[PDB]
């Protein structure tokens, strides 16, 4: 990917490697409600779950 910002002269050097990093791990490619990961377990006692 590529995108270039611009910014005024007053505001100083910032955490340019951390201005991205903490955004990525909160940014989401598809939201799905209150749910995280699905596990396929072992079958047991006449039932696949």
């Amino acid at each position: 990917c590529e995108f270039k910002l611009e910014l005024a002269a007053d505001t100083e050097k910032l955490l340019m490697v951390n201005i991205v990093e903490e955004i990525c791990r909160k940014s989401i490619i598809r939201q799905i409600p209150h749910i995280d990961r699905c596990v396929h377990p072992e079958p047991e006692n006449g039932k696949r779950v």
């Binding site: 995108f3 611009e6 340019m16 940014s27 490619i29 598809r30 749910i35 995280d36």
Partner: protein, 89 residues
């Protein structure tokens, strides 16, 4: 469960019984539509700068090859196009 007034919990959990006919090989593919994929799952490196024009800032991301996030987490440009001018920006 007994005392702590159980609420939003450390390990949320529920059991989903699947049908008699749905396969081993189709169920897990739709388990990857369920799995909450983050946005950071597709990046090799994030090289960022602080240049000057009047201060200039170009972010030059690097991703993976296509056939992994398309493979491992069953998602592609169908929302990676519209996460990158819509959510991350």
């Amino acid at each position: 469960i007994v005392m702590t007034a159980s609420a939003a919990i450390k390990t949320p959990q529920m059991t989903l019984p699947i049908w008699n006919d749905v396969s081993d090989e189709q169920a897990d593919t739709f388990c990857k539509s369920i799995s909450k994929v983050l946005l950071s799952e597709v990046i090799d490196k994030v090289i960022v700068t602080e240049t000057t024009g009047a201060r200039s800032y170009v972010i030059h991301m690097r991703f993976f090859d296509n056939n992994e996030y398309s493979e491992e987490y069953d998602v592609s440009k169908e929302e990676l196009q519209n996460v990158i001018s819509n959510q991350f920006i």
